[PDB]
C-alpha cells in the first residue's frame, strides 16, 4: 500500500576477481597490545594512526615516531580557579586555614 527504500541503491554489475585493484596491507598495534591489519590501495599515503576494531587508535609499526598529532592541553579545576583568585590571595587563604589546624 505504501512504499519506501533504504538509504542506498543497488547495482547490477557482474564482474569478479578477474579485475584486481593493486593493494597492500598496513599493520597497526594498539595500546593493549592487540594487532590489526588494514588493506589499502597501492596509492598508499598510509596514515600513521588508525582506529582499529577494538576501538583503540593504534599506531603504525614501520615508523619509529608517528605524526605528532599534538593537541591543546585540557582545562582543569585549578586552572579555572586561577582566573578568579590571585596567588597573593591564595597565599593568605592558606595562611588563614593553617592557623586553625595549628590551634590544637
Amino acid at each position: 500500500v505504501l512504499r519506501g527504500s533504504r538509504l542506498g541503491a543497488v547495482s547490477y554489475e557482474t564482474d569478479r576477481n578477474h579485475d584486481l585493484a593493486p593493494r597492500q596491507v598496513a599493520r597497526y598495534r594498539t595500546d593493549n597490545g592487540e594487532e590489526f591489519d588494514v588493506p589499502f590501495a597501492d596509492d598508499a599515503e598510509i596514515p600513521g594512526t588508525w582506529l582499529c576494531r577494538n576501538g583503540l587508535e593504534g599506531t603504525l609499526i614501520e615508523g619509529d615516531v608517528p605524526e605528532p598529532k599534538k593537541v591543546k592541553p585540557p582545562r582543569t579545576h585549578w586552572d579555572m580557579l586561577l582566573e578568579r583568585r590571585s596567588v597573593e590571595e591564595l597565599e593568605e587563604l592558606l595562611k588563614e586555614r593553617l592557623d586553625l589546624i595549628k590551634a590544637k
Binding site: 500500500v1 512504499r3 519506501g4 564482474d15 579555572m80 580557579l81 591564595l90
Partner: protein
Amino acid sequence: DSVRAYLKQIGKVALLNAEEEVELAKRIEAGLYATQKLAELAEKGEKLPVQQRRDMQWICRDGDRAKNHLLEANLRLVVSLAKRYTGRGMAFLDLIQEGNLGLIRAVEKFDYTKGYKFSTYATWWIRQAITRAMADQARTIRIPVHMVEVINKLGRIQRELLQDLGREPTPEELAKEMDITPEKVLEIQQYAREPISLDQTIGDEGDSQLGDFIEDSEAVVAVDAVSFTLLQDQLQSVLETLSEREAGVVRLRFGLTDGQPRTLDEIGQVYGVTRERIRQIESKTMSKLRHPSRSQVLRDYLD
C-alpha cells in the same frame, strides 16, 4: 517508577545554612591551593618539614571532602529543576543525572566574594545543562542546537497565532512574524517532524506491524537483472562483429574492458595515434554501428 531510591539516598544529608556555603567554598579553594603547592614544589626539591607536610596533606583531603559534601548537600536542588522539564522527550532521571553535571560546574565556578547564595548561581548552570542535554538527546535524528532553538521559536509563535486566529496558519502568516520566507518556515516544519515507530501494529489488530507491508522501491528486479546481462552479451557480439582495430577504441573509450572511461589522448597509450586521429577513428566506428544494419540488433534495449 523506581527513582525513589535516589530521592531517599540524597535525603540523608541536610541542607546548608547561609554561613556553611562560604565555609565549604573557602575550604575547597584552600585545599586546591595546598594540592597545587605539593605538586609544584616537587619540581625543584624544597623538602617541607614532616609536620607541615602532614598538615598540608590533611588540608588537601579536607578540601576534597568539603567539595564532595557541597555537591552532596546541593544534589537536592537539581531534582526541583528537572521536574520542570520532564516529558519533553528525555527521561526524568536522565534529566536529573545530566543536570548534576552542570551542578559540578556550578560548584567549580561558584565563589563567595560576590556575596550571593550558592543556589542563585547554580540554578543558571543546572538550567543550561538540562537545556543542552535535552537539545542534543531528545530526538532519534539529531538536530543541532541552533536548529532546535529556531524550531522552538516557530512552535511558540505558531501556538499564539493559532490561539488568535483559531486555525492552523498558512506559511506566509508565520513568515510575517519570523522575518523569513514562507518556504523557509515550511522547510523548518519538515525538519521538525519526528519518525514514526516501524513496529506499530497495523490493521486494528495484532495481526501484523507496519513494517511487514512496506514495498521496497530499490528492489532487485529479476527481469532487469537478467536483461542487463543479455545486453552486456549482445553488445559484445556486435562489438565482436567489428575488427579488433575498431573494437578496441570503443572498448577503451567507454571503459568496457576495465570499467574506467579513457580520454582521447590516453587511448593513444597503446594505439600510438594522436588524439585527433583517435577521435576520427571513434567517429568512423560510431557511424558504422549506428547504421541500421546493426542498430536494429539492440535498439529496443534502451527502455
